[PDB]
Design a binder for this molecule. Sequence first.
Ligand SMILES: Nc1ncnc2c1ncn2[C@@H]1O[C@H](COP(=O)(O)OP(=O)(O)OP(=O)(O)O)[C@@H](O)[C@H]1O
Ligand SMILES: [Mg+2]
Lengths: 257, 296
Amino acid sequence: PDYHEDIHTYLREMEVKCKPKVGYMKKQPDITNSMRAILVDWLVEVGEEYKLQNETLHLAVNYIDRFLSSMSVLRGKLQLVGTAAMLLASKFEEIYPPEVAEFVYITDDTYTKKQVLRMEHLVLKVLTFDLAAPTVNQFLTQYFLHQQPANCKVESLAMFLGELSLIDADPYLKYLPSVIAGAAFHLALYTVTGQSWPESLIRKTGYTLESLKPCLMDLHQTYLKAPQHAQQSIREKYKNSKYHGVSLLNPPETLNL
Amino acid sequence: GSMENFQKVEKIGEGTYGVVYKARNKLTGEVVALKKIRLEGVPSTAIREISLLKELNHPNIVKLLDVIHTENKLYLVFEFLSMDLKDFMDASALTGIPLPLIKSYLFQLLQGLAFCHSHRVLHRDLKPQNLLINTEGAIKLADFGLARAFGVPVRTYTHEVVTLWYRAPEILLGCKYYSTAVDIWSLGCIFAEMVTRRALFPGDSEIDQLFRIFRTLGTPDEVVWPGVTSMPDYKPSFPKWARQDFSKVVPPLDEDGRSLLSQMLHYDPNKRISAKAALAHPFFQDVTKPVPHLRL
Ligand SMILES: Nc1ncnc2c1ncn2[C@@H]1O[C@H](COP(=O)(O)OP(=O)(O)OP(=O)(O)O)[C@@H](O)[C@H]1O
Ligand SMILES: [Mg+2]
């Protein structure tokens, strides 16, 4: 209402300030995009197991990427970073976060409670306690208000596509959350209803299909290739009636862009 | 920023985390408030308080100056303010509070709150004990331990919220969604309390709270608040109190003050005035910022 525009403007400012370093993986001696993809897929599973909000998943990924933007991490410790990130995101975002004991349990006893808690402190120090990061999800829910009329399949499909983007650092680290959300919303709208990025959102965001095209071309390929991806937890998650079974929908063969 | 530079002066309050201390920076002379955390890991309340205060730099929001760590302690270093509004109202027991100061404080509280809301923060514990005043006439929102960053549109958040006397009817009736309007309700209760120096709705239970509100503003029906009779905790057996003369709610208020209070206490959160809109209310046409009339 009175604050929708102010909040959008503020989130557009903060997503630039909260953006991880695009080239960080090249600077990591021991970890790879593939290892990151495995971790994020596991976080999706953890989110499923404990019925966490999508927003929590998106925050944890932001924390991890920001952390890895300045901290070298060995492959054996990557899951510890992810576990602490998810614990922090849950404390920030959830009404009822899982207990620390529960995070210790889902590492399959790889780490101790002390390690998890010490890692929590380290992540907070590295991120300088700056946890209120904008996410793809936060932009998506704003964009959804521009539907004519509202369509649950569009919303769930946009969320699915936004989540798929979390898995693959190449190429998605180069795009801002507001842009990924724009691409996801357009692609979902087009798949379900045949409609396109609405003019009301051009007025809100300043983005056009032209400006969204590079991200949209990438997202379309990710969508087309999703059944073949090594990581499948997101596809499995979005089979659920909670998300209207949207991972069952067929992607469009072409976009006309 | 390290603990060796601070000299503790005296206890100035109690919260979660525990006791709050006044301290002095030995090198700069700056007087600060120190909030100490004993180290389930870092408390969610602390995580939210720190993360949100770091974004919220505004003259009417208490300033978080530093966070000092250790393995086992976490200190939050805040700007020091001399008194809270509750203690100020108690000090004004027989003088009353000058209208120019009530007006100034409300205007400043609305400014701080508008800033919070425009930065997607809900405070959720606005009460006089959490509003701090200084010797230069400022009032500032404090204690963000119960705050949260919200989304557009909101989803369902914690149902505990807001200390009972200041709790909005949409929380009391169990609505799945609440948003910025909950903070405006609290400020409306605080506005009334500045004028009368007694809580507007001093309930002891959720139902007592609701009935106190209903006896003051009338029991809401579908015309005044569409959807109310279908809310989870609405009961058809609720007494249907008439709405009294609104001028009797806070008798000293004049036309403009009454108008503003009535808009802050609208039942329907949609209709309830925003902090941003309230800044332009004619009640503030002559607003100034004088110092408090009493030694703090
Ligand atoms: N920056 C500050 N300067 C001066 N006093 C402060 C400051 N911060 C907090 N206090 C004092 O501490 C008191 C309570 O702390 P706070 O409101 O932060 O936590 P709380 O959990 O709400 O406490 P309680 O639950 O007892 O009301 C306030 O009434 C205030 O007088
Ligand atoms: Mg590498």
